Design a protein around this ligand. Sequence first.
Ligand SMILES: Nc1ccn([C@@H]2O[C@H](COP(=O)(O)OP(=O)(O)OP(=O)(O)O)[C@@H](O)[C@H]2O)c(=O)n1
Ligand SMILES: Nc1ccn([C@@H]2O[C@H](COP(=O)(O)OP(=O)(O)OP(=O)(O)O)[C@@H](O)[C@H]2O)c(=O)n1
Ligand SMILES: Nc1ccn([C@@H]2O[C@H](COP(=O)(O)OP(=O)(O)OP(=O)(O)O)[C@@H](O)[C@H]2O)c(=O)n1
Lengths: 487, 488, 487, 488
Amino acid sequence: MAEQQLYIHGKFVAATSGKTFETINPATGEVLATVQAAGREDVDRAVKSAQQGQKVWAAMSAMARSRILRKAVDILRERNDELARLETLDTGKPLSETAAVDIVTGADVLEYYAGLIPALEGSQIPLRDSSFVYTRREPLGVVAGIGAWNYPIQIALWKSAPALAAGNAMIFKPSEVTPLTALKLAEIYREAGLPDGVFNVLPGIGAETGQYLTEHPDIAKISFTGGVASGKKVMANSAASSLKEVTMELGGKSPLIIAEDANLDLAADIAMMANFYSSGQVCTNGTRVFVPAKFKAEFEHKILERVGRIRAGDLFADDTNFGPLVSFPHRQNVLRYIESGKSEGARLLCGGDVLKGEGFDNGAWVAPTVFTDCTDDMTIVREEIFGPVMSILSYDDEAEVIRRANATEYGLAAGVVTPDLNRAHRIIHQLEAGICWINSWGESPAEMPVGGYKHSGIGRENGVMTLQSYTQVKSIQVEMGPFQSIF
Amino acid sequence: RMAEQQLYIHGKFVAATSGKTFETINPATGEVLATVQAAGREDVDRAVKSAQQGQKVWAAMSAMARSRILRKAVDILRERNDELARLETLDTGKPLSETAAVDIVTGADVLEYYAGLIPALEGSQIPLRDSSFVYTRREPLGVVAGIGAWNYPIQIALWKSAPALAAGNAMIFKPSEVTPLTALKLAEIYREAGLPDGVFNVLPGIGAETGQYLTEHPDIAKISFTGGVASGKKVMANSAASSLKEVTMELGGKSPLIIAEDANLDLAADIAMMANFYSSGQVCTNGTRVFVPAKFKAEFEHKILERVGRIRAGDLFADDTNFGPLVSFPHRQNVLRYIESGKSEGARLLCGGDVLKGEGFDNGAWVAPTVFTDCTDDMTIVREEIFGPVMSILSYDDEAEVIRRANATEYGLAAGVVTPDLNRAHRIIHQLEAGICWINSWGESPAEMPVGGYKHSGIGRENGVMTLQSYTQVKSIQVEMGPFQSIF
Amino acid sequence: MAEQQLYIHGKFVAATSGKTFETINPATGEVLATVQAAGREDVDRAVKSAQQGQKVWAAMSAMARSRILRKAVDILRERNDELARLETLDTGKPLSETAAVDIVTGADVLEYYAGLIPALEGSQIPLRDSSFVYTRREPLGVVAGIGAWNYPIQIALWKSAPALAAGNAMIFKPSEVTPLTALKLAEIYREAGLPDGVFNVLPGIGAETGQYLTEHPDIAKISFTGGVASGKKVMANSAASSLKEVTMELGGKSPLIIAEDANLDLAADIAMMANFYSSGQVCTNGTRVFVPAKFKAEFEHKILERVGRIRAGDLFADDTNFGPLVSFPHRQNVLRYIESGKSEGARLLCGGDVLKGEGFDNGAWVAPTVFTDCTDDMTIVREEIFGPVMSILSYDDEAEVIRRANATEYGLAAGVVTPDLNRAHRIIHQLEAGICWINSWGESPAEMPVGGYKHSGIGRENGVMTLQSYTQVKSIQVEMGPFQSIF
Amino acid sequence: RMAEQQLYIHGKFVAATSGKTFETINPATGEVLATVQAAGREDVDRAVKSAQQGQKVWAAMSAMARSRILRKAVDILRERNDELARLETLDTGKPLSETAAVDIVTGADVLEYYAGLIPALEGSQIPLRDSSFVYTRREPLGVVAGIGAWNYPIQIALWKSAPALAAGNAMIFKPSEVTPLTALKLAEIYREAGLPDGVFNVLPGIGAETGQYLTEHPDIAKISFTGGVASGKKVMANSAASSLKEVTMELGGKSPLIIAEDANLDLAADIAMMANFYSSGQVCTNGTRVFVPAKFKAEFEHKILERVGRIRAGDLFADDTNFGPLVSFPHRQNVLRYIESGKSEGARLLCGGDVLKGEGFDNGAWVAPTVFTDCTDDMTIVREEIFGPVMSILSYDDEAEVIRRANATEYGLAAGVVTPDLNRAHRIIHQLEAGICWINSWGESPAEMPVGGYKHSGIGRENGVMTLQSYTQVKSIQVEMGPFQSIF
Ligand SMILES: Nc1ccn([C@@H]2O[C@H](COP(=O)(O)OP(=O)(O)OP(=O)(O)O)[C@@H](O)[C@H]2O)c(=O)n1
Ligand SMILES: Nc1ccn([C@@H]2O[C@H](COP(=O)(O)OP(=O)(O)OP(=O)(O)O)[C@@H](O)[C@H]2O)c(=O)n1
Ligand SMILES: Nc1ccn([C@@H]2O[C@H](COP(=O)(O)OP(=O)(O)OP(=O)(O)O)[C@@H](O)[C@H]2O)c(=O)n1
């Protein structure tokens, strides 16, 4: 590919930083493209561009904004297969995933917010005959989104859709691991009629480009998706610089609770989907699987059968449903977690090594891995691995499993498998997580707010509330009576 | 002198384990009001464990059971309004004519408001398809912390604790070291109303220690802070780095008051007076940049001079006193430096500008009500929040100009316009970059009205229905009644 | 007791009709009191009084109204036992019910709405920089409530609490069978500080006093609770007269569906509470009980065992839990339905006759009655009896029972008994009823909107939506730009 | 001439079984536009069973699938705007300058609005205690019926069907016998967009038969009617008497336009003109009582007469024509009777008051733009809705008086005030008893803005988020997870 440039004010423009980076195809190790990195002056240009675009965008009618976002949706539906193939090259996720999920669910959210724009309303409050209050939900102005590498274009859509629908301009910095689909999205928005400057894309590294965005005094809000540690750094800089509003979607160590009355084929199917989709690189994954002691042996056999059915291979093949990890450095981190599990005595049920042979030696492949006989103090149980590593934990009673499920600083997701009406709601109501699934895993409708408790996040994405959280409330009192001064 | 003040943990006063104390002073006389124990790290952890136990009892009660308890606290606050106001005057130096009419009245108004809204707190339900639906719960955050400021001590304690408790949380409240006394009284009132032990704990202390221990504690889910802009940034950094906590911040401002060319100048002057000299100028929302049309500037100045001459400093318990000392000698020093900066940068001193002297003033940190005119946008007194009784008068020529200059600031808390014209009032207000906007008035903050800052003046909001919701966290729950399909 | 008068503008006043009626104690047949009946002139007097009080009431602050209603709650809590004894004398319901439910849940709704008054807000909608819309939720003005006789004071509170909380005045006409507690409520409201005229009470007969209210041109809304046929007459007259807004809470023939996995002790307890509370005089009663054929015999045995524990007797005795019907004319109608069940071939499981002996011969008693072997064409199955008559129907499959449950013009309530997560939600979602209970019956929280599908009602009571439905929306456009005429 | 128009049932045109037909007339020429089949009792029964089947398919789809189908109907309406407008002009007599700019544009605006709101239609969740909670579903009513009026035929069909379909219902729509043609076109457009067969059926006919059969049908859950006040009461009675159906009614008014003492009289005159003579005065919200201060009355009269002189009647397809004939000759007779009552009751005729005559007018149902002044509150033309181009000008002296007189009516649909004063505008508007209030404008009805009448002018509302919800019914569901306790 040609050297990739910045996207500022409706056009590709060269960065003035003089710095570049490379994105690698995780399946082959080849360089996909050299990408320009946005410097401090480039960020300031992007902000001034965004301020100008936002004024035009906010001045339009609500339905005029709705129609433009709807046109972007139509283009995304049309180009789904092209965008999915690029996403697969950049991330290593199978085309069977990217063509069915990444753009489809990203576009689902943009489509949802496009239709809600006319319903964004303030309130009116009577005080007395001679005075009343009304509120406006005003745009924040210029906001910044910082993406992660596991769902690059989906994340860009989930951040930019409510931001734009609420009347803001967004400057989006994709992950340096996966910068390519965000640049295409910028072109698509422009093609739909989005005014110049309303969506600018600045590739770069977190230490420089990301920091320049979090520090800029004229950016009113930062939305970040990534790891827990990175999030704390971003939230600190965003505070010390300009007191910015913040949204954070971080990782988790989410529990999947298998009840004593659960069907074990359904539970194993849910556990598989909660651990090995996108090669385990999903923040919401149910990586602590709690199984009753009396069912543990049978469940382990059922997991092994299904792990054997996993099909790694050509990411463009129809039957491939497992890919390499996003990068070779990330595979190293996942392997260190696997070795930590072995060294602390967790029993390796399957996997635990790289894949070898024709078509695998050049990719960042890790075998689907399951540890069992796990305990709450193990490193692989306490920490997010962000790879295909399932931990199975035995338990005896309902009160115990609720305590152990909740005994973590993470708080993103949770789930329970049970046919019992009382048990399903009773357990779910006690779990300390923002995203809860009963007898399923992973579905994230555009209507459903998602985000973390405790260290897994600040704020929410999706749902009506996220449109509102990209506005700021202005309260206005009309005093029609005579004003009284005590002086 | 009063008896030594202790910590309030789990429904009773308890000694601090820090071995540390501080004194709170009467700002009118300089006398020590009380010796106050300072909460250490171990005291904070005890307060957190107490709050965790109390919150579970509190959240398990019915919505109306919580509503009734908060309403009993409201009734006590109404009955003791005058006593609490006098204590607030002793601790802050604000006149009783203010404290007895505003501080507890509006604090209790907000608690009364949220007490009635508890049963209206609802989640949502979203159908996906015949075989699946989603519902949401607005669950309590758990243990939250409020850090108060010294200008409206008990009002802030109420504005923070009322929605936090109404949403099902426990709150640990740290009052300002300058003004800890009324928060301890409020803690007793809550218990007397039936609030379960631990649901509202109060930890006096200094910001460098007690405040930091709260922002760092791993089991506190949210920090709500009111104070200065600089102090706000520090608190927001530690709350994130420590445990990624949710945050609300109500900081200061440099709010503009825009007098339109068709305004009646007596009304404009009355609003400017109330926007600058209430609570001796120690109010975050004060309209400290007063923009007046050039053609009316001279006449407006005369009307300000007349009204400033009427300000009555004196005995804080006398009915006709309407002006008090600043809260401390260090704060007055800072205000005096801003005044000297105004003089040296070429602003014209219209009145005031000196400390007050003589019997009844020598022991307090009094500053005369001060007005500068001929001000320009680059002056330090125009650009920075002074938090004292210093009004800056700025001339302007046209509406587009005044909107630009009003918005050309990092602050964003409040704004106002004075005009009888329908189009002008709404048109100007809609363009101002502030969270709290007043048309032909200033200062009123109804319990129903969300208030907070744009830009560097804040994060989040207080009051209104939205603040009850912002003290809950959303849990989304999907019920999948169809057969789950795995692709493996 | 002394002859009961009208309550208009904060005082008892003699009716100008020259007409009176008697309310009978259903336990003894004795006259409890003579009550004056409001004539057409009395209604017009009440309306003018209500118009005057409503303006005072609406001009107060929201919290001032809240505090007054909260004081009425405090008075109702204090006088719970006194009001309940009066209610028992008037209705025949046991004190064990009236002291625990009637005033308690009436006050609960008043207390709920008192707290919501400050949350009643309009909206604000930006159109363009130069124009915006805001809305006000204004009082309707003077509204009328027409109560039923089974829960006299509770119905008076459920109608008046949202009406008053929304800033209206209400004229309340209690049922001529049970007028006494509504007059007590009017005194309590005045004692609490309600402005004169805001709650006026006009006892009378439906054929006259009710019709005069529905016809009055200055009444903006009628809220009626009663039988299906009487409801249709009221709603038509409110139209042919002055296009009034209307709410109707009518009767039902609600189905109770017992699933194949239900515990039969739980199912029998739910069926008992759904049929024999308030001697079967409850609109929401589950009077069609669907049971699986394979469990029919066992369920019948459990029902018979529980019916044997029903304790009829002194209505002021602690252990009494069954009362006479509200009147002898109503008993005659209930007995005709029972005889129809016998003649149409339903099998009588128990009861079916009046109660006899010392202490029963002078009261309007009907024994708890159960029919089984019922079919969907029977009169007792198709029509609301409003007496203690349970109909048991056998079914074979889930699709069948849903069709049969829905095959009715009534639409008030429904319920299912099952421990299965999927079955409970799946069945309930398909039932055509406004009030649905899973593994319970009868609970009606103040927060929960309640009302009928199809012929069982119009509109809802309780919940936030009912406060809003006692206001009317005014939309206000502020046009700040130059207005353009095409002429 | 057009082909004989049939019923539209279940996605296709079908012959009526009533054996009856009626004709629709071109009001500009008196010629027959088309013969139209009238739906009988059995046709209505067929339409209901079709609607029941289609509603199940429609409601089983996802929210976004329904949204996309309505959006495709929007796109077709935008493309066919001019063709539909020309048909509407032929059927109604309204100038193409109106129909091509308003009728389909604002009808499609509302459909477009509700299409996007479908996914935001949500129920609630209410916790009672740890062991029990409530959630609600906003379920479709099922089959609903809309009865349209003849002044805005396709706009009314869209304003009724858009929220009904968006909420998951099927609608059977009965257009006015005067103007049945564009509703049948809309039915074809919905099908072309993918609306499932049966979800929108159209039954032309007369009110006494087809309208009554719909209002009486036991399987129709709700009736929405737009028309005159008298007809509304008959419809609302049969609806209740038959099967207790939910009801919405948008009826007429006698809406007041209040010109304040500080109003610019050219602006006031322009608003009065647009409030009286658009669509030849055949608009329910028209400001037909114009209250003018006594001191300005003579000058206002002059400005009205000057603008009336500019009204351009003529070829309804000419760009500059802005005034049309009335919808029918019987309606013109009613308007002429009202005009004659104004003369005989002593109101002063300023202009108009007769039919228009000459080539191009003798065959149309034309009435000249008419203005009465010196009107009093007891006159028939002041108390009753005329639904023609007849403005009544009434003098007044003070604000309290004009508010009382504005409100002293059984009608309640709209109202407006002309004033530049902030306090006067809101203060007056807050006291008027009308559902639709305009400040310094008239007639704009945004899709976001709920509209409907107080008192005898209506029941319920159209447009806005609340109208989507009012086409659903609430089911409350309690989940009891604790042990159930029986007292028996
Ligand atoms: N909105 C404000 C402004 C000031 N202060 C008080 O006044 C002191 C001095 O004012 P200022 O220097 O403006 O406060 P900050 O911006 O917080 O800066 P610093 O940390 O230097 O005090 C603060 O420490 C605080 O005690 C306050 O409570 N609220
Ligand atoms: N849900 C019900 C059913 C009945 N009733 C009372 O019982 C009487 C007779 O019952 P029913 O025939 O069901 O009432 P309607 O259908 O209204 O018929 P009618 O015109 O005979 O009263 C009603 O008038 C009313 O006093 C009631 O209050 N609530
Ligand atoms: N707001 C209005 C007023 C009138 N009309 C039409 O004009 C006719 C005659 O007007 P009017 O007498 O005012 O109508 P109603 O009050 O309904 O009385 P009627 O029953 O005599 O038609 C109505 O039948 C209707 O076709 C209308 O559609 N909308």
